[model samples]
Target chain A: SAKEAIEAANADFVKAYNSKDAAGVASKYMDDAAAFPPDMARVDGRQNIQKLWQGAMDMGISELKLTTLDVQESGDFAFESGSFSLKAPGKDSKLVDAAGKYVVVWRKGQDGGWKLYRDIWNSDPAK
Target chain B: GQSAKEAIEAANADFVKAYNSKDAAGVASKYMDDAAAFPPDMARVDGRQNIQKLWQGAMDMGISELKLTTLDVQESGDFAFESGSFSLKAPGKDSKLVDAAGKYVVVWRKGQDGGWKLYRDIWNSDPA
Candidate 1:
C-alpha cells in the first residue's frame, strides 16, 4: 500500500514539475513540511518549498528521475528511501546530471492521500 | 514513562555523549540491529555493525566534540522520527578546530528492549 501510494504521488509530483507547475508540485507536501537539500539551509513550509522548486525550474532543471529503493510503513506514517537524478544545464550550457539519495517521511492526511512531511536529499554517490 | 519527545531527546543525548567519547560500540548501541545510516556523499550503511564502522571512519578522520540539537519529534504507533541540528569539531590541516554544522533526521522504533532505538538516520551540511 505504501509503495503503490508513493509511486502514484511521485508520478503526480513529476508531472507537476515537468509542467512547470510549482504550486502543483508544492501541494504534494503538507503545509508544514520541512525539506533538507544539500548545500543549503532547511526549506520549511509549503510556500517556501514552492519557491525552492521554482528556483530549480528556473535554473534549467528540465528533467528529474526518482527510483524507489525502500519503503517502511507504520499505519498513518511511512518513510521512503530512494535515489533521484536531476538533469539540468551546466554553466557551460552542457547538460549536467546530478544524482543522489533521499529519505522522505510521508503522512496520510484526512483526505486519504499521502503527502510529504519531512524531506531530505543529497547528491553525489555514496560509495 | 517519558513522553516521546523526552525519550528521543534523551536518546539523542546518549548518542552525542557516545560520539564525544569516541566509542563506536557505544554509539552503535543506540541503534536498532537492522538500522541503516545515510552518511552524506557515501553509500548507505546498513546494519548496526556497518553503521558503527561508518562512524568509526568519521572518528578516524580526526573529529570530536560531536553535538546534537533536537528541532522536532513526531511519534506514530511504535515509530517516532526526529529532526535536529548537529555540530562537531573536525580536524583541520592547521590542527585548528574545524566546525561542521548540519541538520539530521532519524527514524526511531521501539526495540525489543522497549527503548527507542534509531532505525534510519540521514543528514546533510548547510552551505558555508
Candidate 2:
C-alpha cells in the first residue's frame, strides 16, 4: 500500500521534472525537507529546494526516471531506496545520459500523502 | 526507556568519537551488517567492512576532528531518520588543513541487540 503510493508519487515527480516545472517538482517534498545534492551544500525547506530544481531545469537536465528498489514503511513514515536516471548537457551542450542511486525518507502528512522528507544522491563514477 | 532520538544521538556521538581518534574500524562498528553508504563521486558502498575501509581512507587522507551536530530525528517502527551537519579538518591546497563542513542524513535501524545502527548514510560537501 505505502510502496504503491510512493511509486505513484515518484511517477508524478518524474512528470514534473520532465516538464521542467520547478514548483511542481518541489511540491512533492515535505515543507521541512532537506536535500543533499552531490558536490553541493544542503538545501532545506521546500521553497529553497524549488530553486535547486529550477536551476537543474535551467541547466538543461530532463527525462528524469526514478526506479524504486526497496521501501520500508511504518506509520507516518517510509524510506525508499532507488535509482534515478536523467539526461544532462555535456561539454558540447548535447544531452548525455547519467544514472545514480538515492535514498529518500518520506513523511505522510495529515492529508494522507507521502512527501519526501530527506533526499540524497550521487552520480555513479565514470566507467 | 530511552527515546529513539536519544539513542540515535548517542550512537552518532560514538561514531564521531572514534573518527576523531583515528579509529576508523571503531566508527564502522556503528553500522549494520547490510549497511549501505553513499560516498560522494562514487557508487554505493556496501557492508560494514567496506564502509570501514572507506572511512579509513578518509582518515589516511588526513581528515580529522569529525564533528556531527544533530539537526533533527524522527523515529519509525524499528528504523529512524537522523539529519545533521558535520565538520572536520582536512588538507587543502598545498596540504594546509582547512575546515570542511557539510550535511548528512542517516537511516538508523535498531538491531536485535537493542542498539541502533546506521543502515544507510549519505552526505555532500559544502562548497562554501
Candidate 3:
C-alpha cells in the first residue's frame, strides 16, 4: 500500500514538473517541508519550495525525470530513495543534462495521502 | 526508557565517537545489517559490511577530522528521521588535505534490541 501510494505521488510530481507547473510540483511536499539541495542554503516551507522550483524552471531546467529506486515503509512514515535528471543551463547558456540521487522522508497526512517531509539531493559530478 | 529524540541523539553521539576514533568496524556496528548509505560521488553502498568498507576507504584516505552536528529528529512509530550537518577533512592529491562540509539525513529504525540504528543514510556537500 505504501509503495503504491508513493509511486502514484511520484508520477503526479513528474507530470506537473514536466509541464513547468511549479505550484503543482510544490504541492507534493507538506506545508512545512524542508529541502537540502546541494551547494545551497536549505529551503523550508511549501511556499519557499515553490519559489525554488520556479527559479529552477526559470533557469531553463527542464525535461525533469524522477525515478523511485527504493521504498521502506513503517507505519505512517516511509523512506524513499531515488535518482533524478534534468536539462540545466550549462556553459554559455546551453542546456546540458544533469543527474543526481535523493532520499526523501514521506509522511502520510490525515487525508491518507503521502507527501514529502524531508528532501535532500546532490548532483553527480562530471567525469 | 528514553524519548525517541534522546535515544537517537545518544546513538549519533556513539557514531561520532567511533568515527573520531578512526575505528571503521565500530562505526559500521552502528548501522543495521541491511543499511544503505548514499554518499556523494559514489554508487549506493548497501549492507553493513559494505558500509564498513566505504568508511574504511575514507579512513585510509587519511581523514584528519570529523564532526557531526544534529539539527533535528522526528519519530513516528518505529522509525525516526534524523538530519544534521558535518565537517570532515581528508587527504587530497599532492599531500594536501581537503575540507568538506555538508548536511545529512538518516532514517533510523528501532531494532529488535530496542536500540536506534541508522537504516538509510544520505548526504551531500555544500559550497565552502
Candidate 4:
C-alpha cells in the first residue's frame, strides 16, 4: 500500500541522513528526481541531489528528522506531505535549529518501491 | 472526462490572469473553499478566505507581477498533481522591484462544476 511504502521510504531517508550517507539518502530518490531547495537553483537528478546533501553534511548539518503527515496514492504515483526539523551550522560553527514542511511526489518504481520524484520545501514561520 | 493535464494548465492560466490583474480574491477563488497553502516563510494557511488574505497581503506590499510555468502534471481519477516554477516581482526595501523564482507543487481536485480547483499548494524558493 502507499502508506507502507511511503513510511518505509521516510524511515530509510532519515536513517541515511543521520548516518551522513549522502549517497544512501540520494538512493531514495528517482534518477530524474528534482529538488527545489531554499535559496538555490533547482537541483535536478539523483547525482546532483547527492551532492546537495553531501554539501550540507560537510557543512555540519545534522539532527535531521521527518514526520509524514499525509499520503495519497493514485496508480503508480503517490504524493506525501510532511514536516522536517534539522540543525545547520550557524555563526562560529554553532548549530541553529530549523523547521519546515515538504511535499514530495513519489513514483512506484519497477522494483515495487516508492522513490521521491519531485521534492520541494521551505522554512516555517519564525517564532 | 476532461484531461487532467489540460484542466490543470487552464487553472494555472486562470490563476495567473487573476494574479496579474491584482485581484487577490479572484486568485483565491481558484482554490477550493477548504484549500490549504504552504507558502514560504509563513505558516500553513487554510480556507479560501484566509488564503485570499495571504495573497492580498502580498498585493498590498506591491507584489503584483506573477508568472507561472508548468513543468509536469499527473492525473489520477478525480485529482491531479502539478509541479511548476514561478517568478514574482515585488517591491524591495529600496523601492525597486525585486524578482524571485521558485518551484511549487499543487494538488488539484475536480469540483462538482467540473472545474479543477487547487486543493493543496506548497512552494519554496531556490537560493538566489
**Which candidate order results from sorting by lDDT in descending order?**
2, 1, 3, 4
Give lDDT: candidate 4, residue B7: 81
- How do the residues A1-127 of candidate 1 rate in per-residue lDDT, one tens digit apiece? 7898898899999889999999999999999999998779999999999999999899898788888778889888988888888788878999977778888999999999999999998765623
lDDT of 2 by residue, B1-128 (tens): 89999898789889988998999899999999999898876878899999999999999999888888998888888999888888899898789899988888899999999999999898877777
What digit string (tens of lDDT, one per residue) describes model 3 on residues B20-108? Answer: 89899989999999998987877778999999998999888788578998899888788899888999887656778888788899999
Against the true structure, candidate 4 reaches a TM-score of: 0.92
Among these predictions, the greatest DockQ belongs to 1
Per-residue accuracy of model 3 over A13-46 as CA lDDT, tens digit each: 9899889899999999999999988877788999
Tens digit of per-residue lDDT, candidate 4, span B1-128: 65789888888889999989989999999999978888888887889999999989988888867999998887878778888888988776798889878788898888899889998899877666
All models: lDDT?
0.89, 0.89, 0.88, 0.87
Per-prediction DockQ scores? 0.71, 0.70, 0.59, 0.67
Give a tens-digit lDDT track for model 1, residues B1-128.
67877888788889888998999998999999998898887888889999999989988988888878888888987898899898888876687778989999999999867799999899999888
Q: Tens-digit lDDT track for model 2 on A16-118?
A: 9998899999999999988988768788899999999999998888899999987888788898888888899999988899988899999999989999998
All candidates in order of TM-score, best leading: 1, 4, 3, 2
What residue pairs clash in candidate 4, if any at all?
Answer: A39-B126, A39-B127, A40-B126, A40-B127
> Between 1 and 4, whose lDDT is larger?
1
Better of 1 and 2 by DockQ: 1
Poorly placed runs, candidate 1 (over 4 Å):
B92-96
Candidate 1's error at B28, in angstroms? 1.6
Model 1: lDDT to the true structure: 0.89
Tell me the spans in candidate 3 whose CA falls farther than 4 Å from its real position.
Answer: A92-95, A125-127, B91-95
